Amino acid sequence: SGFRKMAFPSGKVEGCMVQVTCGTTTLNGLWLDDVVYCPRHVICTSEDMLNPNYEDLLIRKSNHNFLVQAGNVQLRVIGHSMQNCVLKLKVDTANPKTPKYKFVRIQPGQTFSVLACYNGSPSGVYQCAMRPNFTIKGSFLNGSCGSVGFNIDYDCVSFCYMHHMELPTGVHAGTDLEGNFYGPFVDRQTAQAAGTDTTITVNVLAWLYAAVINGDRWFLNRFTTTLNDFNLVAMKYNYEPLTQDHVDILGPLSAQTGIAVLDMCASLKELLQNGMNGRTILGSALLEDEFTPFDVVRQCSGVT
């Protein structure tokens, strides 16, 4: 009973967080095996944040300029390299707390947990989604760079995000663990506007199925629709188009509740057209889109 925005347990990731300092800038690093991953903007000065040439700035840096501290103990840096927008600091000690891990590049719509950190210390954990405009609506202050996003599959942590930038509109941009930014964002203090923040339709449907499983059923109507009819409505409301792939992924939720996907689309269509009329669904007065069909199944079944 109940449905909450739930994050993965953060323990496995807390054991990886370290502090990285270069000159006067301190941010967070991710220590996995004998490598510490951190945003390359740790090497940047204030007078050159507008147009930094990272290859040129990195030439002035040596192994001893990267100060890596794990808890209150210093790690010895024996190598450093730049991979896209991340630095990889080879240390002389493998992290004894290295969990089983993978690096994955997620697609928009996919959710993940963020372990927000400052000075290599965790402050909190929250659930996020890669928005369709490749931003994330996080909670990050100065010093949070290098904090990571991840998913967990039993004992394996799939790292998907590393925090790099705050856009002038208070939304967030970052990279996968290969240093490639999600979206068109660049690690420089320049005008970077985000595109349309559309709603993740498949996630809203999954959340409506979670609502039905938990007893919130007022929004269920006597209607049905087609993928094409639904998508005309979705386009009007800045919702992502629904594909047959999305219909297939919602299959288990459709099977559990006995509500066909296209019937749930018709319910969503009426909620978009009429609003909630001051009513709520799973304690929300808006349509939640940061639960994937996988998250709903996981939470509703109790996967550990």
Ligand X SMILES: Cc1ccncc1NC(=O)C[C@H](c1ccsc1)N1CCC(O)CC1
Q: Which residues are catalytic?
A: 41, 145
Closest CB 123 distance from its own copies, rounded Å:
5
User: 20: how many CB neighbours lie within 10 A of its CB?
Assistant: 28
Closest CB 48 distance from its own copies, rounded Å:
23
Name the binder of 49 from ligand X, its own copies, none, CB < 5-8 A by kind.
ligand X
Strand, helix or coil at 23? coil
Instruction: Tell me which of 98, 158, 189, 256 binds ligand X, using CB under 6 A.
Output: 189
Task: Please name the residue ranges forming H helices in 185-287.
Answer: 201-213, 227-236, 244-249, 251-257, 261-274
Tell which positions 244-283 bind ligand X, by CB under 6 A: none
Q: Alpha-carbon distance 183 to 134, whole Å?
A: 5
Instruction: Tell me which of 76, 100, 137, 236 binds its own copies, using CB under 8 A.
Output: 137
* 252 touches its own copies by CB under 8 A: no
Q: Alpha-carbon distance 209 to 252, whole Å?
A: 10
Instruction: Tell me which of 71, 79, 124, 184 binds its own copies, using CB under 8 A.
Output: 124
Instruction: Tell me which of 145, 233, 250, 271 binds ligand X, using CB under 6 A.
Output: 145
User: 274: how many CB neighbours lie within 10 A of its CB?
Assistant: 10
18 within 8 A of 75, measured Cβ to Cβ: yes
Closest CB 63 distance from its own copies, rounded Å:
27
Q: Alpha-carbon distance 180 to 182, whole Å?
A: 7
Tell which positions 65-94 bind its own copies, by CB under 8 A: none
Instruction: Tell me which of 44, 115, 205, 271 binds its own copies, using CB under 8 A.
Output: 115
Give the count of residues interacting with its own copies (CB under 8 A).
52
Closer to its own copies by Cβ: residue 210 or 247:
210
Calculate helix-pair angle for 201-213, 261-274, nearest 10 degrees.
100
Q: Alpha-carbon distance 117 to 138, whole Å?
A: 12
Tell which positions 190-249 bind ligand X, by CB under 6 A: none
Burial of 304 (0-12, 13-18, 19+ CB in 10 A): exposed
* 156 touches its own copies by CB under 8 A: no
Closest CB 299 distance from its own copies, rounded Å:
6
Chain centre distance of CA 237: 24
Q: Alpha-carbon distance 63 to 61, whole Å?
A: 7
Nearest to 55 by CA among 26, 89, 84: 84
Strand, helix or coil at 157? strand
Neighbour order of strands in the sheet with 77-83: 73-75, 66-70, 17-22, 25-32, 35-39, 86-91, 77-83
Closer to its own copies by Cβ: residue 2 or 258:
2
Instruction: Tell me which of 162, 165, 234, 259 binds ligand X, using CB under 6 A.
Output: 165
Closest CB 36 distance from its own copies, rounded Å:
18
Tokens of 53: 């040439």
Per the DSSP assignment, residues forming a β-bridge with 181 are: 175
* 130 touches ligand X by CB under 6 A: no
Q: Alpha-carbon distance 28 to 147, whole Å?
A: 6
Name the binder of 145 from ligand X, its own copies, none, CB < 5-8 A by kind.
ligand X
Closest CB 231 distance from ligand X, rounded Å:
35
Q: Please give the residue ranges that form the binding site for its own copies (CB under 8 A).
A: 1-11, 14-15, 115-119, 121-126, 137-141, 143-144, 166, 170-172, 214-215, 275-276, 278, 280, 283-286, 298-304
List interacting residues with ligand X (CB under 6 A).
1, 41, 44, 49, 140-142, 144-145, 165-166, 187-189
